[PDB]
Design a protein around this ligand. Structure first.
Ligand SMILES: Nc1nc2c(ncn2[C@@H]2O[C@H](COP(=O)(O)OP(=O)(O)OP(=O)(O)O)[C@@H](O)[C@H]2O)c(=O)[nH]1
Ligand SMILES: [Mg+2]
Lengths: 57, 154, 154, 259, 55, 483, 89, 205, 144, 60, 132
RNA sequence: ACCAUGAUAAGGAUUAUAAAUUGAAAGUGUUAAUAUCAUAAUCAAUGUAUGUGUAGAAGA
């Protein structure tokens, strides 16, 4: 069928669906989702100096 | 052209679902026919769209009867077939409108809206004085002033 | 089934090319060049060993085994896991007519006979000449295999 | 007619052909379902007065065999029967032929959308059909042009009550030379099934579907379920399921309360 | 022109001819009468009937 | 009915006959009749088109009997006679590949004969004076879209096919309501429109190469500035070429000299009949939208806070420069009012393409505005009081002209392959179209063209629906009888 | 003429609007040139009435006037539905 | 309903009431006219030279005269079967669920090219086989003593087996090469089953 | 009748630049003067002021005459009457007696007609006599 | 899948918490008995699930 | 910038897919009229030939679909009340289905069209060659 | 102020034998769950990221 948005090229973003039609250098979207789940496993650092202690206040 | 802002794309199905409102607005269809006539080419997809919409608007208030139900389903299949045929003719005319309007803009040296492609002049998106300082898709800095696609002489 | 031997071939061919370039460098007596080629051969072997195990059960893997084994033996790597796997695959590698000749109308002018001298494919069934669908089906490289028989009749 | 939470067709079906409808017509007091009043010559002749046989009387027999034993013959003729004869309504008009054309169905059942038993039976049927299709009866073989025919697969239903043989032709112009001959084989195919495949949930009814690559399949069962769980309305689903649990526990309490 | 187009005139859904009039979905929604509506329209009575009555 | 395959194309002789399209397009739009001849056999069959393009005739070949009839002009003749263009909306109906049609009205016949006399005026001077009542030409007035521009185009065609010097000025707004205005280099207190002047010079030279080449300049200094390699002009064609062929900005100051000397020499000439046709003489008569520059831009300034000037603080409205102060219009008026010049005939027309105003006015949305390129001139105009020419009043088409014009429009568009074509059955017949378009346009020419285009949109025409219904029922009953 | 101005100017030269005003004459098998009409508006005054609902109202008014001028025209007009009133707000 | 407020006479909005009387009168007129009125083999071929030029094969034998032969002639074992002449290339295309094979044989049963190996599978295999076969045919005919002749296309007998998808693609591939391969007999080879050898259990149970 | 827009579009949500819609307050609606723009009432009042400005400018450009105040004696007979002030009486016809049914208030007199009363001091005709064509003369128009 | 398991489990815990109700811890007759048996056999599984939820006998 | 699904996909066709809103004006029509007039008077016909080529390539009659071939290809009955999900799916589906992929539109040298002229020669611009 | 309010979802039968009218419609009639402060003594509140919502609008 239509093989114009079937697979995900690693270079492009997830929402920037690629226009490339090739198959070789592509990973399926289930694999893209698994990779994003395995990749988004970090916490933004908590500001320490920005906010003062409740006991201090 | 004087609509030079960044725009939002719309699927042809939702463009055509308007019908008499904007897609088949009679004044708009008349001036599209005038563009084609001045360019000197037959308005055949336009006339197919026009008759499709005329006949559909002639019945848009009639509620279809509740189908008794035929196992062969040939009736429902034929109805869907004709509906899709009409939709495809309308898609063809929709694409023709954009194609020839961009061609005419290139001919007359009219700058299109942001991220608009003119085949001869700007294969990739033309962006001029956008809210985002860089290319919306290519992530590159647009120059000041906006690129002049055409010559200077009037 | 959307499986490409592209990258496996690309990896293997580099190994063979380095294997040849090493003899050429040794003949030229350029010690630094051959040492660099050996280092790069180890570097590429480490990145190639996973492509081999994933593709070792493919037809394209079956044909480069002896050449790759020769390359490794030339490089004198005898304890390598890939060397042992090549040894295993190579070890596994090494180990009704009819009463009267009759011609069906669908093979009228001259039935195409796959002369008995040529041996039929490895996994194939040698059926009686009477219960042949057609002499082309007894053609050697078209002959039904056991798993193909389990799926399709002729 | 007034239709509430049900289609008008099904509503009229229930109010015409149904145990409580018939009982009310015979004059038995029922409340939840009622028959349609004053239908003139349109009420079914089975339930016309002076015809058929009285269900109020038939309630008296506990078994169908006892009913057959003690039930007197029906009155052969009636005034409404004469009206039906005059209108020509003693036998429904013949619908258009369906045993000589393929099924122009909406979807195409997916390989994953059938039970494993039906799937198993299907590949066996396909194997035997492909092997034996040239050994069809001679009076159909002499006219079938086998050069064009192709069969993609056989799909069938769960438990294989029905089999759907999906077929087409190399050249589309041959479908109307091949279709009637193919539909003349639906008995030979059944006999082939009976003879060759031994594990059959039950001998099916054969139907031919023309698909020259035009029809479109269904989505996989798991993908469809994931789509439903992904886009479904959580609030409404949760409320409905909680109500279902409430009803189940209410019924359990009723069962336990009845000593 | 009109008399020739009368015989050239299409009647089947084909190339550039198609029933966008809801005939496939709704069916025959346009009435068409073969009788003259008494006060407005007129067609001369048939002479077989005229002669029958006169006789 | 498939008489298309039996149809053989007629022999191509003119651009109009070449405008024909493949039979597949106009099969049914222009139904083909069949004529049986007895040539070398009793049965013969010649499938022919019921309608043929209007003839391509020259103005000389046009006659009195052609009044209220449609003729055509070849593309080559069009390009030969109109290098400057076709002012107004006349070229609206002549896309590439379309025949270039033209109606021949009673006024058109009168003008054609008047130009016939102008061709040899010196003998017919009394006739010309009686026709114009002694005035130096005619001015054509009438309502909007009435056909004034088309009549002037036809007059220019008649004169240039008869080989007379013609000064055709399409869209006099290009001169009056031009892009930018510049004071005349050599005429103090007079202004120019350099772009329009250079374009006019180019087109006039190319149009009248023959007579201009044969021309000899009488009153013109022969020490004109000239760059290396260019020969000094010796005839009026070379004068126009020197004027309009130059590199910018050196053309801006050269065009003023060229036009001033050209006007002087044309006024001097007293032997060759010169016809001057201008579209929209009211524009050259009353004013140009350009204003005089504020005197601050001329006096000069040192610092801005010094003089307390408000040029960049507040806009003002200087008196509008009247069209009499342009050099081109100055030459025209010099030749007009100054007698003793029975050699130039001014066949001018007015224009009514102003934007509409009927008591209240908001803002016209840009995308939907058919008056976008209309003129901001709401003042009234009376040709008799505002000009010296003899006024001719035109009205809307009468039924005869309207029928001929609509017949040509519809049938020729479909024949050339730009109309309904295969979809002819979707549109009503020619009689219904004529009746409805006449209602919708009042037989106004521009309205007729506009509604011919809008006919794509008609939604309350049930004729074809009922015709298809009746014919289908007739065929069905015929087949049932046959069974 | 609608409110002292020609129809082609009142309805902004829109073919799809004036043909509704023409319809009562055609449905009646009549020539519009045999009759001259004037339509007066008593509704909400607006600078431009160039729209489908206003055209519908004009067509209905013309049809009713034709019916009362010549009664036998009421046959085709009612059948065409030019005498029927929509109730939509 | 959404449009409950509009009249039934506007739901379809009948129109064109002025044509009914004209249609009735015209139908009556045409009925009167009808009462008053009441009161495919293929083309022809004639010249032998024309037949030869039109069809590319002379009809008249125009060969050596072997006259005075025996008075009775023996029939062919298969009289009704098609006449396969010497220069016909017999290509067999065998389809299966997963694979598709294509071989080509000489009129004498000699294999010309080795076997090559769904719908796209068959199309590609057939296209490659034909591309590689044309040169092989060139060399084989040249060795035999038969030059091609400019523009002379090879006469082909195409035979297909398998009621599988790949047949459509393979035949389309053969069709796409019409300019060089002239298919003269398209037929099927799917065998008639008999007692035959045993079959796998999975087929039965 | 006017086809130009008089009302400001309503704000019920943020629009986008799409096929059938454009951003609110863009440089396309009222000639780019929406760059000055809250409250729909005051916005509509400003739009009304702009529309009135357009009406006034076109109404004044349509004006090609001037309103010199002439003494009663030196005046045409049609204007030698008593003329009610604007909006005081019925629109007054110039002269029904002489079949001149025309709003007297809108009458305009050509400047080359009152040179006898205007510029009485200048003995030279500053504006040459107006040339009037002869209707009762065979001309190109009357020849067919 | 996360949304599916959530949509499958949350009804149970939400009913247990908020919507849990208070607790206080001859041939014709034979054929009717059969019909009741038939309905209960048909809906054996979910009735058992409901009773198990009520009695807190379920292995998450 | 923030990644989005508004990618134009300029690679294919004369027009970027999911094309940007394009709006025509009567001033555009007037400018086109003047440009066409000047071209016709200067005799330049290359651009006319290119315009006719584009019209011929992209203005053929779409093939009538065969029964079973439906327009959505996706049930669209499962997005029950999920209007934004349906809208995203529609955007992506119509972005994938491109005019270059519009199989049902007959386009290419393989097609025969008796309606339009194919070779630029048989146009009225070349009419002296037609006269024997 | 510790009364017995009440919201919520759920059941249903009746009516076109006209082609007229600007308009061919409205009458009629049911189980659970949930809930119930007031006859009383006061007080100033690279590698990359997708939401529900909110406003306008298989009749086993
Ligand atoms: N071919 C042809 N077209 C005509 C003729 N008369 C009017 N027209 C059409 O009328 C349209 C408008 O042109 P004119 O009527 O001349 O315009 P105008 O007379 O200058 O009036 P304004 O538009 O107000 O300036 C053109 O596009 C023509 O197609 C005619 O005699 N022959
Ligand atoms: Mg004009």
């Amino acid at each position: 069928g239509v093989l114009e948005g079937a697979m995900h090229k690693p270079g492009e973003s997830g929402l920037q669906a690629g226009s490339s039609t090739t198959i070789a250098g592509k990973e399926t979207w289930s694999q893209f989702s698994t990779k994003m789940r395995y990749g988004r496993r970090r916490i933004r650092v908590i500001d320490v100096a920005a906010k003062m202690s409740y006991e201090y206040q | 052209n004087t609509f030079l802002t960044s725009s939002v794309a719309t699927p042809p199905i939702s463009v055509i679902r308007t019908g008499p409102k904007w897609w088949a607005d009679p004044e708009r269809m008349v001036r599209q026919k005038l563009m084609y006539f001045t360019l000197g080419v037959d308005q055949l997809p336009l006339r197919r769209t026009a008759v499709i919409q005329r006949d559909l608007q002639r019945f848009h208030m009639c509620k279809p009867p509740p189908r008794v139900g035929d196992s062969t389903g040939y009736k429902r299949s034929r109805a869907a077939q004709l509906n899709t045929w009409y939709r495809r003719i309308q898609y063809q005319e929709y694409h023709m409108q954009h194609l020839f309007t961009r061609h005419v803009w290139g001919l007359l040296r009219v700058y299109p809206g942001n991220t608009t492609k003119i085949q001869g002049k700007a294969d990739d998106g033309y962006v001029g004085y956008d809210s985002v300082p860089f290319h919306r898709y290519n992530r590159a800095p647009l120059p000041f002033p906006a690129r002049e696609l055409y010559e200077r002489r009037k | 089934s959307l499986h490409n031997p592209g990258p496996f071939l690309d990896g293997a061919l580099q190994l063979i090319k380095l294997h040849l370039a090493h003899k050429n460098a040794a003949a030229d007596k350029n010690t630094k060049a051959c040492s660099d080629i050996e280092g790069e051969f180890l570097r590429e072997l480490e990145a190639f060993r996973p492509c081999f195990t994933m593709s070792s059960s493919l037809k394209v893997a079956k044909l480069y085994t002896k050449k790759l084994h020769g390359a490794l033996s030339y490089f004198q790597l005898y304890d390598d896991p890939l060397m042992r796997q090549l040894d295993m695959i190579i070890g596994k590698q090494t180990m009704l007519d009819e009463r009267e000749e009759t011609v069906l109308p669908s093979e009228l002018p001259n039935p195409p006979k796959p002369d008995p001298s040529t041996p039929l494919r490895e996994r194939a069934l040698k059926v009686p000449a009477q219960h042949r669908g057609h002499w082309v089906l007894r053609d050697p490289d078209i002959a039904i295999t056991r798993e193909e028989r389990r799926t399709d009749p002729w | 007619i007034n239709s509430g939470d049900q289609s008008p067709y099904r509503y009229v079906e229930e109010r015409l052909y149904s145990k409580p409808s018939r009982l009310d017509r015979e004059g038995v007091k029922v409340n939840k379902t009622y028959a349609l009043q004053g239908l003139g010559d349109l009420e079914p002749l089975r339930y016309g007065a002076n015809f058929g046989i009285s269900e109020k009387d038939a309630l008296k027999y506990e078994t169908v065999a006892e009913k057959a034993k003690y039930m007197e013959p029906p009155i052969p003729y009636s005034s409404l029967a004469a009206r039906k004869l005059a209108a020509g309504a003693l036998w429904p008009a013949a619908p258009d032929p369906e045993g000589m054309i393929s099924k122009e169905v909406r979807l195409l059942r997916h390989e994953s959308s059938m039970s494993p038993s039906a799937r198993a039976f299907s590949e066996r049927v396909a194997y035997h059909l492909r092997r034996s299709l040239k050994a069809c009866p001679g009076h159909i073989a002499e006219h079938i042009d086998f050069t064009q025919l192709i069969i993609q697969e056989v799909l069938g239903s769960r438990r294989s009550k029905e089999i759907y043989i999906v077929w087409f032709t190399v050249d589309p112009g041959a479908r109307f030379e091949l279709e009637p001959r193919l539909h003349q084989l639906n008995h030979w195919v059944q006999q082939l099934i009976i003879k060759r495949v031994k594990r059959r949930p039950h001998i099916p009814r054969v139907t031919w579907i023309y698909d020259g690559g035009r029809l479109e399949r269904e989505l996989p069962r798991d993908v469809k379920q994931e789509l439903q769980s992904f886009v479904a309305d959580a609030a409404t689903t949760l409320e409905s399921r909680v109500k279902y649990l409430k009803e189940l526990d209410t019924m359990n309490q009723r069962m336990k309360d009845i000593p | 022109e009109e008399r020739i187009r009368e015989l050239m005139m299409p009647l089947e859904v084909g190339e550039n001819s198609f029933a966008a009039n809801g005939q496939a979905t709704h069916g025959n929604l346009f009435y068409f009468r073969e009788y003259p509506m008494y006060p407005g329209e007129y067609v001369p009575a048939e002479h077989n009937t005229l002669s029958s009555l006169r006789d | 009915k498939s008489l298309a395959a039996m149809y053989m194309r007629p022999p191509v002789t003119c651009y109009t006959d070449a405008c024909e399209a493949p039979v597949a397009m106009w099969d049914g739009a222009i139904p083909l009749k069949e004529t049986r001849k007895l040539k070398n056999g009793v049965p013969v069959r010649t499938v022919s088109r019921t309608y043929s393009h209007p003839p391509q005739l020259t103005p000389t070949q046009l006659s009195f009997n052609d009044i209220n009839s449609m003729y055509c002009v070849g593309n080559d003749e069009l390009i030969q006679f109109f290098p400057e263009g076709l002012g107004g909306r006349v070229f609206q109906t002549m896309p590439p590949g379309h025949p270039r049609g033209f109606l021949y009205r009673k006024e058109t016949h009168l003008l054609n004969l008047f130009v016939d006399k102008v061709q040899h005026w010196h003998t017919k001077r009394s006739v010309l004076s009686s026709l114009t009542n002694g005035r130096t030409g005619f001015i054509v007035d009438g309502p909007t879209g009435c056909g004034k521009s088309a009549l002037m185009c036809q007059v220019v065609h008649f004169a240039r096919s008869r080989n007379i010097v013609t000064l055709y000025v399409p869209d006099a707004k290009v001169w009056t309501h031009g892009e930018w205005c510049w004071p005349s280099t050599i005429l103090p207190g007079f202004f120019d429109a350099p772009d329009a002047a250079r374009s006019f010079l180019k087109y006039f030279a190319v149009a009248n190469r023959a007579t201009l080449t044969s021309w000899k300049l009488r009153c013109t200094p022969k020490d004109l500035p000239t760059e290396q390699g260019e020969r000094q002009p010796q005839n009026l064609y070379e004068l126009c070429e020197w004027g309009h062929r130059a590199v910018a900005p050196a053309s801006i100051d050269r065009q003023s000299v060229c036009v001033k000397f050209l006007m002087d020499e044309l006024s001097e000439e007293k032997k060759l009949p010169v016809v001057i046709v201008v579209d929209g003489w009211n524009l050259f008569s009353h004013e140009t939208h350009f204003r005089y520059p504020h005197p601050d831009f001329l006096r000069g300034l040192a610092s801005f806070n010094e003089s307390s000037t408000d040029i960049d603080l507040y806009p003002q409205e200087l008196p509008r420069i009247p069209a009499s102060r342009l050099s081109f219009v100055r030459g025209l008026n010099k030749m007009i009012l100054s007698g003793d010049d029975p050699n130039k005939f001014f066949i001018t027309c007015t224009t009514r393409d102003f934007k509409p105003f009927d008591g209240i006015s908001g803002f016209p949305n840009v995308e939907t505005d058919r008056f976008a390129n209309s003129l901001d001139e709401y003042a009234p105009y009376d040709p008799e009081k505002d000009s010296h020419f003899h006024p001719i009043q035109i009205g809307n088409f009468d039924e005869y002209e309207y029928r001929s014009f609509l017949r040509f429009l519809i049938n020729s568009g479909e024949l050339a392959g730009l109309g309904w074509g295969p979809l002819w059955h979707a549109s009503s017949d020619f009689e219904r179209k004529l009746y409805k378009i006449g209602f919708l346009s009042g037989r106004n020419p521009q309205g007729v063209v506009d509604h011919y285009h809008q006919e794509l949109v008609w939604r309350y025409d049930y004729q074809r629906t009922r015709q298809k219904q009746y014919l289908l029922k007739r065929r069905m009953e015929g087949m049932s009888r046959g069974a | 003429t609608v409110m002292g101005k020609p129809l082609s100017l009142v309805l902004d030269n829109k073919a799809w609007l004036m043909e509704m005003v023409l319809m009562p004459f055609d449905e009646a098998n009549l020539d519009y040139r045999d009759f001259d009409v004037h339509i007066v508006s008593e509704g909400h005054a607006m600078p431009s009435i160039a729209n489908e609902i206003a055209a519908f109202a004009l067509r209905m008014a013309v049809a009713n006037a034709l019916v009362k001028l010549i009664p036998l025209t009421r046959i085709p007009l009612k059948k065409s539905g030019l005498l029927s009133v929509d109730r939509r707000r | 309903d959404k449009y409950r407020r509009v009249p039934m006479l506007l739901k379809p909005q009948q129109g064109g009431q002025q044509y009914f009387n004209h249609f009735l009168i015209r139908s009556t007129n045409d009925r009167l006219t009808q009462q008053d009125v009441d009161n495919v083999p293929p083309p022809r071929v004639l010249g032998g030279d024309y037949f030869k030029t039109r069809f590319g094969y002379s009809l008249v034998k125009n060969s050596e005269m072997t006259q005075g032969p025996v008075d009775y002639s023996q029939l062919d074992m298969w009289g009704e079967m098609p006449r396969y002449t010497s220069d016909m290339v017999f290509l067999y295309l065998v389809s299966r669920r997963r694979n598709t094979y294509a071989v080509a044989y000489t009129y004498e049963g000699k294999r010309i090219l080795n076997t090559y190996t769904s719908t796209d599978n068959g199309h590609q295999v057939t296209s490659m086989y034909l591309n590689d076969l044309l040169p092989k045919l060139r060399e084989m005919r040249a060795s035999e003593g038969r030059p091609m002749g400019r523009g002379e296309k090879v006469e082909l007998v195409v035979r297909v087996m398998g009621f599988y998808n790949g047949r459509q693609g393979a035949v389309r591939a053969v069709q796409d090469r019409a300019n060089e391969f002239h298919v003269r007999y398209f037929e099927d080879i799917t065998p008639f089953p008999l007692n035959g050898p045993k079959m796998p259990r999975g087929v039965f149970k | 009748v006017s086809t130009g827009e008089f009302d400001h579009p309503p704000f019920q949500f943020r629009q986008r630049h799409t096929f059938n819609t454009t951003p609110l307050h863009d440089a396309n609606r009222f000639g780019g003067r929406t760059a000055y723009l809250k409250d729909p009432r005051t916005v509509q009042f400003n739009v009304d002021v702009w529309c009135a400005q357009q009406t006034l400018r076109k109404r004044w450009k349509q004006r090609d005459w001037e309103v010199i105040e002439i003494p009663f004696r030196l005046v045409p007979r049609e204007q030698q009457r008593v003329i009610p002030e604007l909006y005081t009486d019925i629109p007054q016809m110039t002269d029904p007696a002489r079949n001149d049914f025309s709003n007297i208030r809108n009458k305009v007199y050509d400047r080359e007609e009152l040179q006898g009363v205007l510029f009485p001091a200048a003995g030279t005709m500053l504006y040459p006599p107006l040339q009037r064509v002869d209707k009762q003369a065979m001309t190109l128009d009357k020849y067919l | 899948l996360i949304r599916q398991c959530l949509r499958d489990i949350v009804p149970v815990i939400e009913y247990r918490n908020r919507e849990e109700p208070a607790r206080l811890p001859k041939r014709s007759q034979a054929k009717l008995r059969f019909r009741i048996r038939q309905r209960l056999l048909k809906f054996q599984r979910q009735l058992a699930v409901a009773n198990a939820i009520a009695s807190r006998s379920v292995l998450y | 910038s923030k990644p989005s699904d508004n990618v134009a996909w300029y690679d294919k066709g004369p027009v970027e897919w999911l094309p940007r809103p394009v709006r025509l004006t009567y001033d555009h029509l007037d400018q086109l009229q003047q440009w066409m007039m000047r071209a016709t008077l200067d005799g330049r016909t290359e651009e006319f030939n290119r315009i006719r080529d584009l019209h011929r390539e992209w203005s053929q009659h779409p093939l009538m679909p065969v029964l079973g071939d439906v327009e959505p290809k996706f049930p669209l009955n499962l997005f029950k009340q999920n209007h934004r999900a349906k809208k995203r799916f529609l955007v992506r589906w119509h972005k994938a289905n491109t005019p270059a992929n519009w199989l049902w539109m007959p386009r290419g040298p393989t097609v025969v069209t008796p309606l339009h002229r194919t070779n630029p020669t048989q146009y009225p611009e070349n009419w002296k060659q037609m006269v024997q």
